[PDB]
Amino acid sequence: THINLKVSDGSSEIFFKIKKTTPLRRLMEAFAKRQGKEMDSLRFLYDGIRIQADQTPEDLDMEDNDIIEAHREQIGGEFMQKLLSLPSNLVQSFHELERVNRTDWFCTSDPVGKKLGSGGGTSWLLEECYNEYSDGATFGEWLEKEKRILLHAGGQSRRLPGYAPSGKILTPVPVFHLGQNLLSLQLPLYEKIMSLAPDKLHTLIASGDVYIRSEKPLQSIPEADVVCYGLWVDPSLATHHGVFASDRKHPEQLDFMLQKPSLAELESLSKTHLFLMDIGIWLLSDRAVEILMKRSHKESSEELKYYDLYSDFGLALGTHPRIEDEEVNTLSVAILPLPGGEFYHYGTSKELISSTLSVQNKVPAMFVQNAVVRIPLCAENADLWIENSHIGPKWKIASRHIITGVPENDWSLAVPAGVCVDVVPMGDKGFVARPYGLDDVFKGDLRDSKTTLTGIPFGEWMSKRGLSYTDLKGRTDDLQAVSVFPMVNSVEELGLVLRWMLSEPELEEGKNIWLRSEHFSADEISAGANLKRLYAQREEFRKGNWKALAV
């Protein structure tokens, strides 16, 4: 008495006739043989549990026309090196802070001076890695050796001040795994991809501020020189991103690239092309890497040049490139839709909150991590993110807040809706107070009424406190470089000055403190932050949160 069984890899289903008392070893071996691989490289699941190979259908009570799911399995084995472009202050400390070893993890920062872009940055990352792990080989020989995952996270993070000095990707994210952050949440996708990739694509490039997800298995990975992942997009969303346009009859090859097309330009091609949103996951062959790298160097001298991977290099790809490049155009290109692909941005504060809510609600918009909260919390306090902070019982809060870094205190601090509070350790014992607003973009000349601090015009913020531009040493063209935030040496002064910078501008001692305190811009904060004290405080809050009998 026999039974028919489907096995699905994610795309197709294939039927096996087998006797109910025959071990599945034969079936799994045959399915592995069919898909070129071998049974060791596959994971067969039925009902959700991983099954052995010496088990018979009668053992696990399966019936005719049932389906078993065959996922790939590249968990252990040859591990890829991670190359990070990070803020320079975090480079010195990343390995100690996250306790990873330098064999698996290399990082650097853009050199002090001019910026290099996505392409130039990638070239500098590959170069700085080779210069430390070459072991005598040449560059082309070194690149062949390992698969490597490169992450761009070295920008200024103007719109996410709470985690700019730690590069955004080191942000703790809750759950409702062990302890985890954005990077640890995202990296398994990159690792799975890079395992499934051919052994000629040795460099994955990830950039942007978008967390990518998918609950379905990946498709096979072509053997082009450039592979790019994307999501099928209607123009209503294509217009906001980089777009791969492909011919109607050729949904695999890349026709050309677009950087944020207009709604009309897309309607002008709606009959002749399909559109994929670039999600910032690329794979390059060694030849692609060499060509990108030489395009990231000058003509005569071979050193450094701003080169944009997506607007310079990228726009030169496809069968109908828009910008000319002799060598770049010769590279083949594959555009892969991400099966079950999902994307959630985290470049801005509002996005941190809403994206973590959306991601959590897949495997209520209030999030408390590594914190002591001494006030009650109800559904009126919606859109909340408290992390590495002590919220004393005399605080008054509302909704839409990001509170990060706040040391232990009994402050009577009121926090208006939409206002956020960040504290950043500085020096051996100081604290920089960085209040701001949920929609501050931290860009703009100070004399423009659209340039805001804590959601009100900067000039107004200055005049409510009796301050003039005479009290600001330095530039005023760009709020991100304006030294407004004071460094103080006590939690008392810290609370006094924070109150003064929010709802109590009449607090005289607050203004006195600010006037006698060193002033930091956001750039100087993320350039000088004492990350070790920030992590130490976070861990002390964790340890306190593990005291089971404490209320």
Side-chain angles (χ1 to χ4, degrees):
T1 155
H2 290 2
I3 279 305
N4 309 319
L5 298 173
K6 295 203 284 295
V7 61
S8 169
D9 57 357
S11 47
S12 56
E13 302 165 333
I14 156 129
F15 270 101
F16 297 70
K17 173 101 61 181
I18 50 161
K19 185 183 178 199
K20 291 187 293 204
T21 54
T22 295
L24 291 153
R25 154 135 276 164
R26 293 294 160 94
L27 192 154
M28 301 152 76
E29 126 223 287
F31 184 65
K33 159 113 182 176
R34 170 183 157 99
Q35 310 212 318
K37 303 186 170 171
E38 233 140 7
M39 198 204 311
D40 55 334
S41 60
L42 294 184
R43 235 195 201 179
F44 289 93
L45 318 175
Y46 174 76
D47 208 45
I49 182 178
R50 174 171 61 183
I51 57 193
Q52 313 152 14
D54 297 327
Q55 307 187 114
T56 70
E58 192 190 33
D59 292 313
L60 67 167
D61 292 352
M62 40 189 199
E63 45 188 336
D64 181 47
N65 275 232
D66 281 354
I67 166 180
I68 54 180
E69 273 180 19
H71 300 257
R72 306 150 308 254
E73 190 176 39
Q74 299 288 324
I75 163 172
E78 289 189 348
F79 232 20
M80 307 115 189
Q81 215 185 8
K82 277 64 67 159
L83 314 200
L84 291 169
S85 194
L86 297 183
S88 51
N89 180 45
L90 174 75
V91 158
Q92 300 309 315
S93 284
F94 165 90
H95 293 105
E96 185 183 340
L97 293 172
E98 301 282 335
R99 288 160 52 170
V100 288
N101 59 81
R102 281 168 179 274
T103 68
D104 303 5
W105 298 82
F106 175 80
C107 49
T108 187
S109 44
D110 270 16
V112 191
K114 205 227 305 182
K115 313 184 179 177
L116 306 171
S118 41
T122 319
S123 286
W124 168 261
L125 189 57
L126 287 177
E127 201 160 318
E128 277 266 296
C129 192
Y130 160 82
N131 281 267
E132 189 167 308
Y133 307 91
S134 74
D135 207 8
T138 64
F139 181 87
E141 299 177 344
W142 167 86
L143 200 108
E144 293 177 330
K145 302 191 175 180
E146 281 148 357
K147 279 168 175 307
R148 275 173 288 252
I149 296 162
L150 325 203
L151 268 104
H152 293 300
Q156 300 173 279
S157 304
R158 283 168 189 253
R159 294 153 320 163
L160 194 63
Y163 293 102
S166 65
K168 289 202 224 56
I169 59 180
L170 303 184
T171 305
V173 37
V175 197
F176 148 67
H177 46 248
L178 274 166
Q180 72 181 344
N181 46 33
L182 265 301
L183 178 53
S184 94
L185 201 53
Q186 172 75 91
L187 186 64
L189 183 54
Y190 302 160
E191 291 174 332
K192 188 169 73 177
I193 283 165
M194 208 54 177
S195 65
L196 184 47
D199 287 315
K200 180 187 70 173
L201 318 173
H202 306 143
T203 66
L204 179 153
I205 302 173
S207 85
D209 299 316
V210 56
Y211 169 63
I212 298 299
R213 207 172 161 269
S214 83
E215 297 178 303
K216 296 180 191 175
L218 304 170
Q219 75 277 71
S220 193
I221 297 184
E223 304 208 18
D225 302 309
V226 178
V227 183
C228 301
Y229 282 93
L231 297 176
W232 301 108
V233 286
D234 178 74
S236 66
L237 185 137
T239 183
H240 296 83
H241 306 82
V243 177
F244 313 118
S246 58
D247 173 33
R248 210 78 181 185
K249 294 285 282 185
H250 306 68
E252 274 190 7
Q253 301 191 340
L254 164 79
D255 201 359
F256 49 96
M257 274 197 205
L258 306 176
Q259 296 300 329
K260 293 192 187 179
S262 68
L263 313 96
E265 181 178 10
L266 296 153
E267 292 316 308
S268 183
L269 295 192
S270 66
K271 276 203 189 75
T272 54
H273 284 74
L274 283 189
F275 310 113
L276 291 107
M277 165 185 41
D278 185 355
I279 57 179
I281 301 162
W282 293 23
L283 320 172
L284 303 194
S285 73
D286 294 26
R287 174 170 146 255
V289 161
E290 164 180 283
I291 291 177
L292 171 61
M293 291 202 49
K294 67 199 303 179
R295 287 298 182 258
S296 306
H297 295 73
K298 322 152 160 289
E299 282 271 293
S300 306
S301 168
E302 233 178 318
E303 200 50 43
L304 65 96
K305 192 181 75 162
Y306 174 90
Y307 190 66
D308 189 354
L309 183 63
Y310 311 93
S311 285
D312 305 0
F313 187 92
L315 288 181
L317 298 170
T319 68
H320 295 79
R322 297 197 146 194
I323 71 139
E324 295 173 1
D325 206 309
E326 330 184 65
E327 305 206 356
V328 173
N329 199 23
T330 324
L331 297 170
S332 48
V333 48
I335 304 311
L336 306 181
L338 184 57
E342 302 163 42
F343 67 101
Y344 305 93
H345 286 279
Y346 59 78
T348 73
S349 304
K350 226 163 177 70
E351 282 174 357
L352 179 67
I353 297 172
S354 43
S355 281
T356 65
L357 179 56
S358 296
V359 169
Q360 199 181 67
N361 284 6
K362 287 238 146 53
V363 246
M366 291 174 59
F367 303 114
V368 188
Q369 288 173 100
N370 314 320
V372 162
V373 179
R374 295 232 193 274
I375 37 121
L377 288 192
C378 45
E380 282 86 347
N381 309 132
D383 293 344
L384 198 50
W385 177 291
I386 306 164
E387 193 278 310
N388 189 7
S389 291
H390 186 275
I391 300 202
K394 299 162 203 183
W395 287 42
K396 299 101 188 143
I397 72 181
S399 63
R400 307 200 317 287
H401 302 299
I402 291 177
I403 294 159
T404 56
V406 170
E408 170 170 320
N409 77 83
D410 189 24
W411 297 334
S412 55
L413 175 65
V415 183
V419 171
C420 308
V421 174
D422 177 53
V423 174
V424 178
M426 190 67 65
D428 291 318
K429 23 199 177 189
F431 303 96
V432 172
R434 187 229 296 279
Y436 59 98
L438 190 69
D439 299 309
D440 289 359
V441 293
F442 270 87
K443 205 181 204 96
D445 188 275
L446 304 178
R447 287 186 164 86
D448 191 335
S449 88
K450 294 177 183 58
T451 305
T452 65
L453 178 64
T454 72
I456 68 152
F458 190 80
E460 175 170 327
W461 185 94
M462 295 259 71
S463 62
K464 298 192 178 178
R465 302 175 164 75
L467 293 175
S468 77
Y469 302 113
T470 71
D471 310 302
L472 294 180
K473 306 193 168 176
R475 339 160 18 187
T476 72
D477 49 292
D478 175 15
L479 177 58
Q480 172 78 11
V482 171
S483 295
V484 213
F485 307 102
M487 190 183 62
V488 311
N489 289 93
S490 68
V491 170
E492 294 69 78
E493 300 188 353
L494 176 50
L496 289 168
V497 84
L498 268 172
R499 288 164 65 198
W500 175 79
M501 301 177 76
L502 307 182
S503 304
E504 303 173 61
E506 66 278 15
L507 191 64
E508 195 169 286
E509 184 50 25
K511 183 183 185 197
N512 290 335
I513 292 175
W514 184 93
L515 283 169
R516 65 162 131 106
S517 285
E518 190 181 354
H519 294 163
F520 290 66
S521 64
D523 288 333
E524 303 168 326
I525 293 178
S526 66
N530 197 313
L531 299 175
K532 290 184 213 187
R533 295 173 55 206
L534 182 78
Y535 276 64
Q537 175 183 290
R538 178 183 305 163
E539 187 55 39
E540 176 60 48
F541 281 122
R542 297 183 170 156
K543 151 169 192 40
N545 285 166
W546 279 76
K547 291 306 195 212
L549 307 169
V551 184

